[PDB]
């Protein structure tokens, strides 16, 4: 059980300072320590508990390992082969006229991402729309951009970490008190480039829905917190970005860089994994990663009336 | 509330802020002299109002981990005063308190001699059935003085009320001592004396009934 | 801009103090205005302020006992403090206040704060919280290097302060009004002297203008040897 | 720290060797596969 208070000088803003007992290295002896949790990881019954403790057990990610995705080549063994379609306008299944063969694919970065696809490969010529049943809404829609838009994601907060030993050999790394200002994590996207990209996508979109039909963009409105948000990883921390700023448009017939709010969670169950959860250890210092948005994942609202909206 | 600081004349004084800011800050520096209106010297950490001499300066908030300091170069006797550091930061909230005052004293301040003026009771006061001897002490530095009254050659112990020394508009101190007598006591002794000892040296003035 | 206070100078305990501040040389309507006090053996205490929208905000440490107002028709700022006690005795200063913005990040993430600074101040007005009535000062002349010393005794008045002038302007210097003494009676007495030429004596004239507004009293004294 | 603790409990966890196993070293032959 965690005894928690709000930060205390919150003018307009959530993260909570908690205190609790902990087993030390000796079984019998105890220590009272304090940690800082982003309030997504805790729930109340001021008394609190971790979100995960009633759903599943938990384990702490080793500090040494890095979550920075590197290109991986998938290879087939001898006697088998991989065929690679080099058709630029390739619409997602079908006969590929220009085909080359390889024993191993090119370097595929395993970027864990939601909604928008990050640091990927760009389609040449026109942007490409890939689905499985275009008239069907239940099946998602894959978009590959021709021009990548640039997105700068930072956690400004000066996170300090301390190391408390909780058992023999075992050592938990906890988020110390923040030093300096309290700023929330965010991501910037040039409004001009994102407006061009959004334009070009709807140009290729109308190829499948008749020609001056009303094409609007709304926010995600379904599912859990972990799925509705642009979830990803950056420097070690897991970002849950609210993407309302981008998908708030309607199409018919200065820098001004858009800003996106991002919350942070340290307890995570990605890929719908219920069972052994992971605690993302706190990352010391300020975080800044610059990434490309190379693709998108869209979904319809339902059978539309067809040439109406 | 008072935090004493002493500085040699003509050197650079550095007054630390009482509070260290939790978050990025806007600090104001007020100079307050006893009995006068406080003065804004620095606002917004480093900004100086028109008329404030470029002798004073504050530390800019570049986000480096540096405390708010007030620098006074070529410190003058006229810079003797209280300095308050009004600290605004992002995690403290609206800051009602001015904080404590750093009392700045200027020093190796020459040792001026006191001037002494002794007045006998008025003819009017004696007709009003009262008598008060008035000893005025001015233009001394430093501020510590000892005033003794004597009736003839022996020390009066009472009837004596003396103001605490305070700095005047020539940066030197001034005090006054009042010995109230009855008219019959005044005519009783051949002479009364006001003796002032400053910095070990003793001077004295004398008056007699006439 | 110029600020001059006015005040009672004496307020009974449990009564309501009132002080006023006239502004000249700038419009009242476009600025924020504030009250600050100094109590003896303490520091400057921030009481509260009034906005250009005539909205008021107060230090909690006043415990809602304070009310600050504006009268544009007289260009005058005002303040009342109810239910006073001897700790409410203080010099009371009225000041201008400027709003500034300290922004460290994104506006929308609220990553900014306001602060205020007082750039113009009044001289202050002394206000005492005490039971007794005003008592006028009996004033007595103090008779006279090539110079003589000349003075006036201002005896047993209450409360502070007393103004002392000499001939109005002509005797500006070298004239020195000493700090007053607080008698064990609780009365106040000060003295004011001037250094004059011995030759001027018997040919010139000097009197001291003694003002005790709280009395209120007025007098002049011709000093002669 | 009379009070004591095991040396290891602050450095690492610990496990007890099974009683049955013997630590008496026996000759081992390292072999390379066919073709080497
Ligand atoms: C994603 O996108 C996001 C947005 O799209 C983006 O968010 C942005 O984050 C950045 C930081 O990363 C934010 O930047 C901050 O901006 C602050 C505001 O800057 C503007 O305003 C100031 C001040 O202007 C007022 O005062 C002057 C006085 O001369 C007047 O002339 C002005 O008219 C103005 O007064 C009006 O406004 C007042 C309210 O503020 C009103 O009350 C008043 O009535 C008036 O209406 C300007 O000077 C700025 O211009 C300068 O900067 C621009 C670039 O932005 C230059 O092009 C230009 O040439 C100028 O150089 C600007 O217009 C900054 O104050 C803030 O920087 C301070 O804070 C940080 C830390 O907290 C300090 O490290 C830094 O030193 C700065 O502190 C100085 O100032 C304070 C306060 O005054 C002092 O107390 C302090 O000591 C320090 O002074 C020192 O430096 C001075 C120079 O700065 C120097 O003059 C002094 O002598 C001394 O040495 C910071 O930069 C930005 O606001 C966010 N955006 C938004 C929309 O919120 C995000 O980062 C993006 N993410 C990415 C990329 O990953
Ligand atoms: C899309 O693609 C782009 C392009 O690749 C991606 O953007 C890149 O993202 C990278 C990872 O997200 C990021 O890499 C990090 O950069 C940090 C800063 O780099 C600076 O230093 C290096 C030299 O080391 C310079 O070459 C460079 O120019 C910079 O000046 C590094 O500090 C990061 O390394 C640390 O983090 C990784 C985990 O990500 C650890 O494996 C690594 O060991 C480092 O961690 C140690 O250091 C930090 C310092 O604060 C400590 O807090 C931490 O505890 C570690 O310290 C322990 O270990 C050390 C070493 O053993 C030991 O001495 C110490 O005592 C401790 O025990 C990391 O390399 C890229 O900068 C960024 N690219 C650009 C151009 O910005 C983008 O992410 C992609 N998109 C997505 C979604 O992934
Ligand atoms: C382990 O613990 C964690 C956290 O402690 C659990 O996560 C929380 O789970 C609870 C319930 O399982 C969930 O609460 C619901 O959230 C829904 C979505 O936000 C709400 O819609 C729902 O509200 C309905 O139920 C309330 C009573 O609980 C009613 O007061 C309310 O009016 C709602 O009822 C309306 O809607 C229903 C359905 O349409 C209808 O039948 C009714 O007539 C009425 O119209 C609950 O508030 C929390 O949201 C979860 N917390 C978080 C942070 O996600 C986790 O579930 C636990 N583990 C297991 C295995 O159970
Ligand atoms: C888990 O616990 C175990 C046991 O409880 C730990 O094992 C012990 O670890 C400690 C320190 O880590 C170690 O103590 C040192 O041993 C050194 C070698 O014998 C000594 O040289 C050293 O003495 C210096 O430090 C003292 C203060 O601790 C000083 O009083 C002394 O003067 C020495 O300082 C001089 O030398 C240094 C270096 O040159 C110099 O900078 C100084 O100026 C000065 O000149 C300590 O006594 C024990 O020896 C270890 N015990 C055993 C039985 O081996 C284990 O480390 C803990 N685990 C972890 C992960 O920390
Ligand atoms: C989030 O909550 C955690 C709780 O674990 C909190 O840590 C504690 O904060 C309190 C804040 O009061 C700290 O207590 C202070 O400690 C200092 C140094 O020892 C004392 O000087 C303080 O005393 C002053 O304030 C008192 C207030 O009533 C006065 O009565 C007194 O006269 C003093 O003026 C005060 O006791 C405590 O030290 C920490 N604990 C640890 C282990 O650090 C954390 O600060 C909270 N987060 C934030 C941002 O505040
Ligand atoms: C997040 O917050 C942490 C605070 O916990 C902050 O860490 C601090 O950063 C500064 C560096 O910016 C460190 O200061 C240095 O520390 C080293 C080692 O002690 C010193 O050698 C350095 O001395 C140099 O600078 C002096 C300046 O006066 C010189 O006089 C001297 O000769 C040296 O050149 C310097 O003091 C500080 O130690 C840490 N603190 C801790 C507890 O680690 C960190 O900077 C913040 N993160 C980010 C990204 O800003
Ligand atoms: C991509 O476009 C091609 C058109 O070249 C689609 O292929 C046709 O799909 C329809 C059904 O939508 C079939 O009835 C035709 O037999 C296909 N034509 C040819 C020439 O093969 C393909 O289905 C599109 N892919 C997606 C995911 O919509
Ligand atoms: C993000 O996109 C930029 C372009 O906007 C990429 O930068 C180019 O990278 C290629 C290598 O694939 C170089 O040949 C180009 O010269 C680069 N462009 C410029 C203008 O210099 C960048 O590689 C992308 N980042 C990824 C995929 O992580
Ligand atoms: C993301 O960050 C990069 C680099 O920090 C930004 O690129 C800068 O863009 C401006 C013009 O808008 C140039 O003046 C700089 O020279 C660029 N920096 C470098 C190092 O080349 C990019 O604009 C940022 N993206 C957003 C949306 O703000
Ligand atoms: C992401 O940001 C948007 C703001 O655009 C949030 O949308 C608001 O949601 C509430 C209900 O939760 C509605 O009543 C408001 O009308 C919405 N705002 C607007 C401008 O339409 C949204 O809730 C945020 N999402 C998350 C998960 O935090
Ligand atoms: C730690 O345990 C003790 C029981 O000995 C308890 O009283 C205390 O509340 C615990 N600490 C916290 C932060 O709750
Ligand atoms: C896929 O689209 C076809 C086209 O008419 C439709 O008949 C079919 O029902 C759709 N399949 C699903 C699973 O919705
Ligand atoms: C839609 O517009 C495209 C591009 O101008 C054109 O080729 C196509 O014929 C149009 N479709 C219809 C049904 O008019
Ligand atoms: C985002 O949606 C809200 C809600 O209708 C709207 O007020 C706002 O103008 C939209 N933003 C843009 C850029 O269209």
Author numbering:
A (entry chain G): 128 to 140, 153 to 184, 189 to 309, 312 to 321, 321A, 322 to 397, 410 to 465
B (entry chain L): 5 to 8, 11 to 66, 66A, 66B, 66C, 67 to 95, 95A, 95B, ...
C (entry chain H): 2 to 82, 82A, 82B, 82C, 83 to 100, 100A, 100B, 100C, ...
D (entry chain G): 184, 189 to 223
Can you quote the paper on this entry?
Broadly neutralizing antibodies (bnAbs) against the N332 supersite of the HIV envelope (Env) trimer are the most common bnAbs induced during infection, making them promising leads for vaccine design. Wild-type Env glycoproteins lack detectable affinity for supersite-bnAb germline precursors and are therefore unsuitable immunogens to prime supersite-bnAb responses. In summary, we have developed stabilized native-like trimer immunogens for germline-targeting and boosting of glycan-dependent PGT121-class bnAb responses against HIV.
To ascertain whether stabilized, PGT121 germline-targeting trimers maintain native-like structure, we conducted crystallography and electron microscopy (EM) studies. Although this resolution precluded analyses of side-chain conformations, and the interface between trimer and PGT124 could not be analyzed due to missing V1 loop density, the structure accurately determined the backbone positions for most (1,659 of 1,692) residues of gp140. We conclude that MD39-10MUTA, with 20 mutations relative to BG505 SOSIP T332N, retains an overall native-like conformation. Compared to BG505 SOSIP.D664, the MD39 yield improved by a factor of ∼7, Tm increased by 10°C, and antigenic profile improved, with reduced V3 Ab reactivity and similar bnAb binding except for slightly reduced affinities for V2 apex bnAbs. The MD39 mutations improved the structural uniformity of the 10MUT trimer; the amount of flexible, native open conformations dropped from 35% to 5% between 10MUT and MD39-10MUT (see the Experimental Procedures for a description of the 2D classification system).
